[PDB]
C-alpha cells in the first residue's frame, strides 16, 4: 500500500509499447526530401509525372 | 521597366487575382512554372505575392 516503485517491469512494458506507438504516429509527418509531409496537399497543387 | 541591377519589386495582397485570363493569352514567349501547374492556378489562395 506505502511503497511505491514495486512494479516497475509491467509499468516498462506498457512504456515500451505506448513509446514505439507514439514514435510510429510521429514518423507519419516527416517530409521524406519531398515538399510536404501532406498528401493531399502534394496531390492538389501539382501534375503527375 | 527598370534595368537588372536595380529590379523594381512589389507586393500583391488583399485583392482577386484572375490567372485563367493571363495564362490563356498567347502574347507570352515562354510561360513556364515550377511547383505549381498553371492550369490549378485558380483554385489556390496564397498569403502574399
Same mark, same amino acid.
Given at each position: 500500500s506505502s511503497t511505491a516503485s514495486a512494479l516497475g517491469k509491467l509499468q516498462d512494458v506498457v512504456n515500451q509499447n505506448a513509446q514505439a506507438l507514439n514514435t510510429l504516429v510521429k514518423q507519419? =509527418? =516527416?517530409?521524406?526530401?519531398?515538399? =510536404?509531409?501532406?498528401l493531399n496537399d502534394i496531390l492538389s497543387r501539382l501534375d503527375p509525372p | 521597366f527598370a534595368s537588372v541591377y536595380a529590379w523594381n519589386r512589389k507586393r500583391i495582397s488583399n485583392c482577386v487575382a484572375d490567372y485563367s485570363v493571363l495564362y490563356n /493569352?498567347? /502574347?507570352? /514567349?515562354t510561360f513556364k512554372c515550377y511547383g505549381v501547374s498553371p492550369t490549378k492556378l485558380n483554385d489556390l489562395c496564397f498569403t502574399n505575392v
Open positions: 507519419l =509527418s =516527416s517530409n521524406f526530401g519531398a515538399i =510536404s509531409s501532406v | /493569352s498567347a /502574347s507570352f /514567349s
